[PDB]
From a paper:
Creatine is obtained by the diet or synthesized by endogenous enzymes, and specifically transported into the cell using the creatine transporter (CRT), a sodium- and chloride-dependent transporter, belonging to the solute carrier 6 (SLC6) family. Impaired function of CRT leads to intracellular creatine deficiency, resulting in X-linked creatine transporter deficiency (CTD), a disorder characterized by intellectual disability, speech and language delay, behavioral abnormalities, and seizures. The structure of CRT adopts a typical LeuT fold, consisting of 12 transmembrane (TM) helices, with two gating helices, TM1 and TM6, each divided into segments TM1a/1b and TM6a/6b. We determined the cryo-EM structures of CRT in the apo (CRT-apo), and in the presence of substrate creatine (CRT–creatine) or inhibitor RGX (CRT–RGX), at the resolutions of 3.29 Å, 3.40 Å, and 3.39 Å, respectively.
In the structure of CRT-apo, TM1 and TM6 form a translocation pathway accessible exclusively from the cytoplasmic side, suggesting that CRT-apo is in the inward-open state. Notably, in the CRT-apo, a distinct density has been identified as a putative Cl– ion, with no additional densities observed for Na+ ions. In the structure of CRT-apo, TM1a bends ~33° toward the membrane plane, thereby opening the intracellular translocation pathway. Comparison of the inward-open (CRT-apo) and inward-occluded (CRT–creatine and CRT–RGX) structures reveals that the most evident conformational changes are located in TM1a. The conformational changes primarily involved the displacement of TM1a, a phenomenon also observed in GAT1 and GlyT1 during the transition from inward-occluded to inward-open state. Meanwhile, the Cl− ion remains in its conserved position and is not released.
Numbering used by the authors: 56 to 187, 202 to 603
Amino acid sequence: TRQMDFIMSCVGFAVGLGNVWRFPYLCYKNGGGVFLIPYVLIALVGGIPIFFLEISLGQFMKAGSINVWNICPLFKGLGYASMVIVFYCNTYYIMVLAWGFYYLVKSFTTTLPWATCGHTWNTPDCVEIFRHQLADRRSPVIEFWENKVLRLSGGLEVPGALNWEVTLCLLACWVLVYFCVWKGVKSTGKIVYFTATFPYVVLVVLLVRGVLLPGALDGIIYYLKPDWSKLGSPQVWIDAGTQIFFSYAIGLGALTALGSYNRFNNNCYKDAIILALINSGTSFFAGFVVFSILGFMAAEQGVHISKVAESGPGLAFIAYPRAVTLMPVAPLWAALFFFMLLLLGLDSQFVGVEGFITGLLDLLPASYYFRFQREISVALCCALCFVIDLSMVTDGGMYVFQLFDYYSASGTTLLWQAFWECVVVAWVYGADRFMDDIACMIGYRPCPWMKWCWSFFTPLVCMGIFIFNVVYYEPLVYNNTYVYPWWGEAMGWAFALSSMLCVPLHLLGCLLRAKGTMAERWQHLTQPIWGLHH
Ligand SMILES: [Cl-]
């Protein structure tokens, strides 16, 4: 009967800010068309196989967080790594909401703030209507993004003064997150439909408008037709692989929990394929929506598409709000779009904080148990994350955000986590045995492509990307202007290492704390710990 409900659950987990904001920004940063080829290749070879692996593993083990790795306890540190990654997400992901929140609070006006060059934050280069020195001029959307919301400083060396307008919005977002996490709201219980169809509808509307703009065809062509000389650069491969591993929540421990929630005999293969296709399609649709507006902007200003908008994380706050200035009733559509953005970000933040706090409290001993341990733990986590984000709501804040975006919960971190997960499942545990278990779970034997991806294809893809980036290293640059100094990249590597060291350190600690020679230690510490069902 109501099979559609299940579908909504899928989209209720699939669409997020990694599709509407990160995918377009990454695509524009690496060039439109050339980014899709590694995207498709990694989605087929690394994305979907790891998606199915994680979902099936969670379903088979019937447990999420760190316990899922009881198939190979020696590598349980993998779970710890995930618990770190999600934490870092909760640190900087909320930042997007704050900026979005700001826009929403500025949306309810008679005329939109980012449509006039007669404000105080604007520069003398602000020109409302473009005509035929001609490069220094900046559109009012860019002025609002880089003069009021961000107040961008010279570089990461100059943090500057705290931005109170965005600080209060960030505090409001964190208080709302705490209130809903403490209440344990049944978000997307039955009204899932709206929370699962409000984005697409709005996006569909945007797409229609995005198509009816002169010069949008050039933007779409730039989005689709690739430049083949950019395939040799390993940066596009990092961006595509990590974007897939980010939008799919691969390595963050989300797919494992989702699998653990399902029934034992549920068709996890179909669920994984459907979820991956939904997520990729949403990313592609957001790509159309952004790039049509980008082509319109490039035609209007007369500059190239690659230089019209910011290659920094502000595309969702430059490409999307600009589109709103074209709709018949701009403030209404601004409020609607940023309300949808806020709802998506809040759902993702709620589930992330729920999972992180639940796992952290699980690992804590019974002696540490406070009276209101849930309330106090959520409050402490939110306060600590707000204190950390105080570094992102300063003038030199976006730079820090970039450091949290490229290096933390992305980049080589996700490659490391995915590679180790594939090695543990396929090699140490046994890919053949896991395939047999999935066959006995869901009935039919999956395609052998899954086994070949777990065993040799995906681990070698991750290792090859990692090696081609370590050998050919390019310092992180923000929006083609700010080349990061040595200490900024050192801090980024500090985040990456704080995430990636969980696996080797856990393995060494487990081996050292065991007894006997290394052979029997390895044999005993990798023995799976089966649950009651198995
Ligand atoms: Cl995606």
